[PDB]
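Help! Submission page says 'invalid entity' but I think these are all valid:
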Amino acid sequence: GTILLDLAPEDKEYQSVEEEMQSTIREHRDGGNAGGIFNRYNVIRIQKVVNKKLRERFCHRQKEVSEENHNHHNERMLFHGSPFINAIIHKGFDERHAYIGGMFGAGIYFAENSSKSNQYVYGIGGGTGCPTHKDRSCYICHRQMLFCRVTLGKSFLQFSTIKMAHAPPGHHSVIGRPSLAYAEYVIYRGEQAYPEYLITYQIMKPE
Ligand SMILES: COc1cc2ncnc(N3CCC(CN4Cc5ccccc5NC4=O)CC3)c2cc1OC
Ligand SMILES: [Zn+2]
C-alpha cells in the first residue's frame, strides 16, 4: 500500500515546501471568511507520500501526454484542498468522485496559492468548518492539505465560468485566470496528479 515518510525540519525539502506554502498566501475578497483569517501557517508536520502503483500510473500517463504535446508534459507543483485527503493518499485522485456541479465541471481543482486550497479543506466555501467546533476559522484543529505534482500538458486558458466533463479536445487541463481573483488549475483525470507531499498544519491568529 501507501508509505508516509516523515521529513525533518532540517531536511532542505521540508523548508522548500514550507516556503512555498507560507509565501503563496494572499488575502481574499471574502473577509477571510471561508478559509479563515490569518497571515501565516503553523506547520505541524510534512510527510512525503510513496505509493508504487500510484507512481506507475502517474509516470505512464505523463508519457502519453508528452507525446500528445511535443515532448513536454508540463508538470507543476500545486496545492490541493478538500475533505478527502485521507482517501486520496491511499487511492489517488479519482475523477469518478468529481461531478458536473464544480466551478469548471467534473474536474479535480488545484491552486498555485496555499491560501486558495485552504478555503476548500472543510468543503466548498468552508462547509460547516471543522468537525468539532463548526468554525471556518479554527485556530486549533489540525488541517491538512496536499502539495502535488500535476501534469498539465497543454492548458486551455479559460476566463469566464464553463462546466465541462473532460479536458477540451487537444488539451489536457483547464486554467481559469483573472480580470476571477487568483489562478485555478483543473485536470479531468486523476492520474494527472500525484500527491507528493502531505502537510499538516494550523492557521495562526494575528494578534
Ligand atoms: C470517500 O469519497 C471520496 C474518495 C476520493 N478519492 C479520491 N479522489 C477524490 N476526489 C477527486 C475529485 C475532487 C473534486 N473536488 C471536489 C471538491 C469539493 C469541495 C471542495 C474542494 C473540492 N475539490 C475537488 O477537487 C474531490 C476528491 C475522492 C472523493 C471522495 O468523496 C467525494
Ligand atoms: Zn476546531
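Support: the input was valid. A stray whitespace character was the problem, and the output above is from the cleaned input. The radius of gyration is 17 Å.
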